[PDB]
Amino acid sequence: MGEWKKAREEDKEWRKSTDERLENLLNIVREILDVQRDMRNDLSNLTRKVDRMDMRLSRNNNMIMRSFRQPITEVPFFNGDIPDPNLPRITRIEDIDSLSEENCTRYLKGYGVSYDENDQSLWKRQLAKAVGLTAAYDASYTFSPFS
Amino acid sequence: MGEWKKAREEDKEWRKSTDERLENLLNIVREILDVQRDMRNDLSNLTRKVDRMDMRLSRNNNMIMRSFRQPITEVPFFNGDIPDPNLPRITRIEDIDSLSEENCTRYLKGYGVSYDENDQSLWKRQLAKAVGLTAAYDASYTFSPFS
Amino acid sequence: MGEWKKAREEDKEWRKSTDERLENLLNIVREILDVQRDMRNDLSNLTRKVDRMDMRLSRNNNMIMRSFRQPITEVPFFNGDIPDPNLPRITRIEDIDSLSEENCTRYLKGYGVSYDENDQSLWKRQLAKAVGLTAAYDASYTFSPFS
Amino acid sequence: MGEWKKAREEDKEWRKSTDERLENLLNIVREILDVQRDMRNDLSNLTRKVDRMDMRLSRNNNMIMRSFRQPITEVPFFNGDIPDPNLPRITRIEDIDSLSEENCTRYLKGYGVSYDENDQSLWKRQLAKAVGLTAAYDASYTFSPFS
């Protein structure tokens, strides 16, 4: 029964080792969870950045392309998707100049560029400058007012 | 034997703490597994997007380059690899205009652009517009029919 | 009581299995923590590299664009942010040639290009060459000295 | 003592639950380690691919830029670093045509393009075609032999 008691004691000490290692597991996996959280945030960051750059290069290439009387191409949205396929694809300036106002706002949202709710006068120009309609004729043309 | 009994009980309570911490490990590592699943999905997303943009810029640069009677360069596939090295590299328009139909379909698949199985007439033009053959002569040239 | 003793021993052996598996958990999660550390370092690396390339392409595109008397666009910083919005956006060369010295240093820091604290004479030219002011007139123009 | 015995057995069964959950931890963290291994491989893949594309676009842009008698820019290596800063930066064709042979080999390695150890005659041309020296004069010029 003595040996039972000492054995008992060692057991409890064994319990303590077990317990502290279990705590080791607890905190280590806590740090792992936090690290994975922050990596996920980092990856979200990188996704936003790649999509941004995509929009940028598509635009700037339409820009040069416009100098040769060549049609422009579609442009992705600040989040990556192709625009709402009900929303008319864009090819030249009068296409814009004929668009509806709500669609103009939709677009302006699609390119992440902020406008004023009252100054219609700058919507068309700023949208042009967003997609890349930049040629000399693109400057000399005059936008029409809405209905 | 009394002390044995109370000791026994404490052991059992100790068991309960052990058990609930073990459950802590279980669910925390479950969330970690799910988070890693997600992250993997996110990274797949980012890979697709980077490859996409790669194709886009290669094309658009061949586009400008075509304006100066300069040869075009090879173009990656929507998934990144170089094309099937048995598939003839592309340098100018007649190269396409001499290609076999099955190879045309192969290409059209390689650039992720959908065509119609019956309208051969638009394959060549749409492939051109995919790689970047855009010059004025590129418009004035007439494609030949297949064999 | 015999059976108690042998049973006791078995449990001790059972304890050893438990212990070694716990060590298995310990070292495996250690390696996981290290692997996540190094992945985080890798991702930081990739972020720096993507931002770098972003700056590069923005610049080089302003470069071509300058050949056609077309205005330049803003440029990101070596770390990604848009410049200090109090810091005047840049459109052409005289804009620089009118800037204050401390702002020049700020910029030069923003583009990660090193200069000399005494040789003011090369600041303006090197900043130009950093953003892309490259045209023939951009070479023939003479910078003004500071106040 | 009866109750001691039954209690003892339940404990043993409790041990079995503990053991199988521990195995649950073992294999689940094994899969996690493998998944992280493979993600690391995937990320290495993505790094190589982004650097590749970087080299590609830098080159192709020097290509167009060459058509206007404009100086070329430095080019990254297949692994991302800037070249050995003791290795002379490249600006035009005669710069190459004056280079040492070992430096030529160094370069050819820097751009991941394979050459023949005996045919010196194609080194210079292929290096040109690697960086982008593409203009009509770039074709009409004749390379000089080594010392």
Curated annotation (Swiss-Prot), chains A, B, C, D:
Superkingdom, taxonomy of origin: Eukaryota
Localization per Swiss-Prot or TrEMBL: Nucleus
Key words of the record: Meiosis, Nucleus
UniProt GO cellular component terms: nucleoplasm
Swiss-Prot/TrEMBL GO biological process terms: meiotic cell cycle; meiotic drive
Membrane-crossing residue ranges in chain numbering: none
UniProt family annotation: Belongs to the UPF0612 family.
Function, in words: Has a role in meiosis.
UniProt name for this protein: Meiotically up-regulated gene 135 protein
Organism (species): Schizosaccharomyces pombe (strain 972 / ATCC 24843) (Fission yeast)
Residues shown, of full length: 118 to 354 of 357
